[PDB]
Amino acid sequence: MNLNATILGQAIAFVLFVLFCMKYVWPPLMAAIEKRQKEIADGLASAAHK
Amino acid sequence: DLDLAKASATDQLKKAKAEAQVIIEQANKRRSQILDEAKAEAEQERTKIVAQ
Q: In Å, how far is A29's CA from the nearest CA of chain B?
């Protein structure tokens, strides 16, 4: 259709959202969730017969 | 599991630690019994031989 500056505007939005996700969101979300999973994994590892 | 581990470990170890020493002192009671019986019959043997 009409070749328009909106494409480059949307590219700026796309790249900055990916960078914000990489910096702020993803590392802490995965850290908290997998730290719960780690605690349950050790809950398996902990289990008086031994 | 950790609580029952503590409880069972202490229970087992302290119970056996008591009974072992108790049996060893019982063996000393039998030791004193045997030693005094040997002494008494040794001197009865001597007295009977000299009376003979």
A: 32
